[PDB]
């Protein structure tokens with residue numbers, strides 16, 4: 333792993349491990365998600381930002397401010413096989429006072445073809461109060477020198493799937509997985525439930541018949557609230573659709589408080 | 602990763618990843634366990650055996666026979682930090698008709714000091730009937746050429762922790778974590794619940810104040826039965842003492858035993 337020649341992006345190669353593959357002998361979407369997070373963290377380290385998943389500046393730490401993901405969007409064309417080398421490039425861009433965006437391009441190291449792409453929107457919030465806030469000028473200036481100043485988008489299209497509005501699933505859901513609880517492996521270095529865990533929980537309510545005959549092509553997830561260590565979650569899915577599409581909702585098992593919402597698109601294997 | 606000069610052992614280096622560390626900025630025991638499994642799998646690949654976690658020979662596949670873990674024992678002296686390079690060496694040894702043993706030595710790449718060690722006992726069984734069998738002469742001859750013929754033990758000391766008898770926890774347990782269920786990430790490439798998941802489940806019933814003030818030094822686990830995708834498990838722990846605990850995993854319904862084990866923790 334290293335920053336690229338112009339220092340405005342970061343690249344790193346990964347060799348798919350035996351325990352990282354699923355029922356098809358290819359990397360799972362959760363293996364891909366961890367690798368996206370790993371390369372994002374290595375990028376923050378390289379330019380001096382925090383490495384705790386909050387990618388903070390010295391000014392942000394003084395003010396108890398952190399970066400939090402509001403939306404994650406991943407599109408995989410080909411899942412790498414066990415032992416394959418995948419190259420991932422990542423970069424950040426400011427979206428003015430709104431927040432920041434981190435993009436990723438996944439490539440097969442051998443052919444150089446783009447096997448996937450991802451985008452994420454991040455908002456600033458006070459860690460203690462949980463209150464969101466627009467990005468200050470001082471913080472913006474600390475980061476802008478590490479970003480390309482001309483737009484560089486992983487999803488440049490006009491009506492791309494990464495910007496689609498996501499509705500709230502209405503009861504009754506077609507399918508459900510109830511009483512899901514995080515274990516210590518589901519928490520990060522700061523005892524917070526990892527965003528990759530939520531991807532796994534969304535996918536738990538997809539029937540096994542879909543998982544067996546299809547491959548996940550797109551997953552978009554809108555994050556609303558954090559799930560604590562002692563929280564219990566219910567994962568809800570309703571079919572909305574050649575391809576299959578689903579609408580997802582994660583909510584607390586008790587009061588039904590919303591944690592996440594999302595959509596998936598699957599293609600016949 | 603590569604087989605060593607004499608071809609009777611396999612070595613590989615790993616750089617600790619950001620998502621592999623815990624609340625102490627060091628690798629978790631589950632990160633270590635996955636790396637042990639990864640290097641065991643790379644060893645099987647290198648000499649032509651199956652890479653599905655069963656390490657089968659051509660004769661075993663013809664007879665629907667597989668290798669299954671009966672006991673796992675891990676001892677960690679120092680957990681590697683994020684970004685550190687850990688070298689792991691692994692080898693197998695036949696234990697006659699009983700079964701086979703896989704050993705591991707973990708080292709800090711920079712200093713060369715032994716930061717940890719592990720041992721595992723494996724038994725042969727028909728994958729369909731689940732009936733255990735003593736190892737046939739034909740199968741023994743297929744893999745003896747890949748093993749050191751003189752004993753090479755990660756735990757050579759007589760009366761060592763890796764051989765201790767494990768009793769069954771008696772009700773009431775001091776602590777418990779009930780209704781644990783595996784998700785798809787908890788299954789391997791063949792839709793079976795990964796052995797590393799059981800290590801996580803044993804540790805769920807340890808109080809958080811132990812986890813916060815101590816480091817896990819030793820974990821021994823005796824495997825009795827597999828947990829299916831739709832099974833629900835209860836993890837039970839009682840203090841026996843450093844701090845020591847006795848563990849039991851059992852089905853949430855009938856109380857059928859899945860696993861039993863012991864842990865030893867050192868104050869931070």
Ligand SMILES: O=C1NC[C@@H]2CCCCN12
Pocket residue numbers: 379380381388389390391474475
């Ligand atoms: O935390 C901050 N804020 C600005 C400065 C730039 C160099 C890396 C660390 N940085």
Ligand SMILES: O=C1NC[C@@H]2CCCCN12
Pocket residue numbers: 400401402455462555556557558
């Ligand atoms: O996890 C949380 N808690 C509130 C905030 C809303 C936007 C992104 C996700 N967030």
Ligand SMILES: O=C1NC[C@@H]2CCCCN12
Pocket residue numbers: 648649650657658659660743
């Ligand atoms: O006899 C057998 N059965 C499978 C394995 C392949 C490598 C050579 C020795 N082998």
Ligand SMILES: O=C1NC[C@@H]2CCCCN12
Pocket residue numbers: 669670671724731824825826827
């Ligand atoms: O996982 C299973 N199923 C039966 C067998 C008995 C001893 C080794 C571990 N076991």
